[PDB]
Amino acid sequence: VETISFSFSEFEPGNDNLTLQGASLITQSGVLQLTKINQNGMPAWDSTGRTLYAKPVHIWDMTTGTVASFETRFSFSIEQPYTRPLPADGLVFFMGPTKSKPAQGYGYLGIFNNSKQDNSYQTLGVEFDTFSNQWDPPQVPHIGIDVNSIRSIKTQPFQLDNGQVANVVIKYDASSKLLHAVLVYPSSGAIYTIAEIVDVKQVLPEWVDVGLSGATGAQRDAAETHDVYSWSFQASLPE
Amino acid sequence: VETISFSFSEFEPGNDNLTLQGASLITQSGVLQLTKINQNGMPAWDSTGRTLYAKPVHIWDMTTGTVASFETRFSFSIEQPYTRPLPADGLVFFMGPTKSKPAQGYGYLGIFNNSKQDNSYQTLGVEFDTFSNQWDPPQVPHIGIDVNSIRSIKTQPFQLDNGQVANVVIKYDASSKLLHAVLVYPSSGAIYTIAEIVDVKQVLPEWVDVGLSGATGAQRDAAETHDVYSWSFQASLPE
Ligand SMILES: OC[C@H]1O[C@@H](O[C@H]2[C@H](O)[C@@H](O)[C@H](O)O[C@@H]2CO)[C@H](O)[C@@H](O)[C@H]1O
Ligand SMILES: OC[C@H]1O[C@@H](O[C@H]2[C@H](O)[C@@H](O)[C@H](O)O[C@@H]2CO)[C@H](O)[C@@H](O)[C@H]1O
Ligand SMILES: [Ca+2]
Ligand SMILES: [Ca+2]
Ligand SMILES: [Mn+2]
Ligand SMILES: [Mn+2]
Numbered sequence: 001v002e003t004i005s006f007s008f009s010e011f012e013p014g015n016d017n018l019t020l021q022g023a024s025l026i027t028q029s030g031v032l033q034l035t036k037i038n039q040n041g042m043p044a045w046d047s048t049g050r051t052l053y054a055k056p057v058h059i060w061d062m063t064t065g066t067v068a069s070f071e072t073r074f075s076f077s078i079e080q081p082y083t084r085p086l087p088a089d090g091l092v093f094f095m096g097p098t099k100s101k102p103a104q105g106y107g108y109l110g111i112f113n114n115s116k117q118d119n120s121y122q123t124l125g126v127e128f129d130t131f132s133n134q135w136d137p138p139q140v141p142h143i144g145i146d147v148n149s150i151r152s153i154k155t156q157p158f159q160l161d162n163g164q165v166a167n168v169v170i171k172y173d174a175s176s177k178l179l180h181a182v183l184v185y186p187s188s189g190a191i192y193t194i195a196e197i198v199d200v201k202q203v204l205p206e207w208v209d210v211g212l213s214g215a216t217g218a219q220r221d222a223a224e225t226h227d228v229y230s231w232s233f234q235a236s237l238p239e
Numbered sequence: 240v241e242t243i244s245f246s247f248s249e250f251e252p253g254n255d256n257l258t259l260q261g262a263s264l265i266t267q268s269g270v271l272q273l274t275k276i277n278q279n280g281m282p283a284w285d286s287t288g289r290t291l292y293a294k295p296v297h298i299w300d301m302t303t304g305t306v307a308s309f310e311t312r313f314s315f316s317i318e319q320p321y322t323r324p325l326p327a328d329g330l331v332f333f334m335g336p337t338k339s340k341p342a343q344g345y346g347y348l349g350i351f352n353n354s355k356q357d358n359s360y361q362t363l364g365v366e367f368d369t370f371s372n373q374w375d376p377p378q379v380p381h382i383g384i385d386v387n388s389i390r391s392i393k394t395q396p397f398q399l400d401n402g403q404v405a406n407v408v409i410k411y412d413a414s415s416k417l418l419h420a421v422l423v424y425p426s427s428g429a430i431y432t433i434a435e436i437v438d439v440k441q442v443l444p445e446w447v448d449v450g451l452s453g454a455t456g457a458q459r460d461a462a463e464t465h466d467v468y469s470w471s472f473q474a475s476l477p478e
Pocket of ligand 2: 324325326327328345346347370372455456457458461
């Protein structure tokens with residue numbers, strides 16, 4: 001069994017194991033701000049930011065045919081301060097090719113370039129979508145499981161607790177090829193759950209980068225915050 | 240689509256839609272006590288109690304070949320007041336043949352008669368096991384998915400927050416034959432999750448009874464409480 005794991009109760013500026021891209025930034029108070037926040041303390045539009053763990057993770061081995069089981073936990077808060085226009089765009093937990101750079105922003109959440117399903121992406125993502133695009137279901141916000149496409153294969157609407165901290169748990173069992181995610185708002189006690197079959201062996205490359213990505217809207221004030229307070233990850237490749 | 244749903248924020252004594260069996264009892268304060276509590280306020284051993292919704296639910300149709308998607312939510316607390324011996328036995332959410340009576344107590348949680356896998360049971364259960372029997376994994380308590388057998392096909396250890404209220408969400412997606420359950424302890428913020436493939440069409444009869452069951456140990460003081468504070472259920476059979 002080879003393993004890998006990190007666990008941040010809070011974030012520390014200048015930490016080497018974290019790669020910040022785009023607007024992504026860590027405050028001295030220990031919080032990770034994926035998207036830009038102005039001097040007046042309010043969310044800026046047309047912003048994209050990502051954070052990747054500096055070490056690649058071995059998700060599966062082509063030689064032995066074994067695939068790893070993994071689990072990730074993080075807590076974040078999304079604040080939508082504007083009355084109008086509609087807020088955007090959301091944040092995602094993703095896995096993909098190592099040494100990747102930010103893709104398209106807005107509805108693409110910084111991890112995709114278009115709305116076409118392209119196995120060439122080799123990207124798996126669990127999104128918390130706050131804006132309804134042409135490819136999205138009517139309800140927002142919604143949790144979505146993205147496999148090589150911004151058009152989720154599965155979707156689950158949820159109630160946003162504006163400014164409140166949400167706890168997320170995403171788990172993958174290699175034995176059943178089952179990916180289950182959970183969203184919990186400690187404040188209200190609300191619980192949301194999504195699950196779906198995902199063959200990691202058919203989607204991702206043997207080695208991947210794990211990260212978080214966030215993005216704000218394409219027009220003035222179509223924004224919200226994407227703050228992350230903690231993040232842990234663990235993977236186990238048997239053989 | 241035919242549907243059915245109930246939602247109890249609290250329990251009311253004398254409610255007609257609830258069938259109490261065994262020691263099961265509802266207090267005037269609105270709580271459902273599955274297992275007996277003595278005059279000294281402490282849990283009694285050798286106790287078994289169950290509660291079933293008085294109306295059967297159509298889980299699948301053999302004629303159209305359609306299967307229903309369902310979701311159930313309930314909150315409970317288990318208090319293990321004795322230093323010794325080890326506490327037992329746990330509680331379960333189950334689905335099975337309509338008009339059923341309590342089965343064996345103790346490790347069988349009141350829904351099974353033996354440890355043998357018998358498709359004749361036609362019982363599906365999500366257990367919160369507090370005692371480790373010969374057929375259980377070493378770790379207790381643990382969440383377990385039971386399909387026609389007390390020997391879970393899947394298990395997940397969890398940390399008991401003695402006397403604290405736990406929130407549970409069990410969901411079944413007919414499209415993926417996926418059963419995902421979640422346990423959350425609001426107090427500590429702990430989150431546990433289990434998921435597995437279950438073909439309801441192959442396990443349960445077209446019509447079933449949904450209920451909760453609890454049981455205490457086979458020897459003096461091998462007990463704990465099994466209190467339920469709320470319970471809601473919803474099912475949707477398309478066609
Ligand atoms: O408003 C946030 C929303 O914008 C979409 O892009 C719009 C853009 O805002 C609008 O000014 C222009 O005329 O058309 C674009 C396409 O409809 C983004 O695509 C969406 O993801 C959000 O960011
Ligand atoms: O102690 C709780 C535990 O008891 C098991 O049954 C025991 C019984 O307690 C003991 O006195 C007797 O000698 O042997 C039985 C079988 O090992 C139950 O099976 C278990 O579910 C718990 O209830
Ligand atoms: Ca979107
Ligand atoms: Ca047991
Ligand atoms: Mn979406
Ligand atoms: Mn068990």
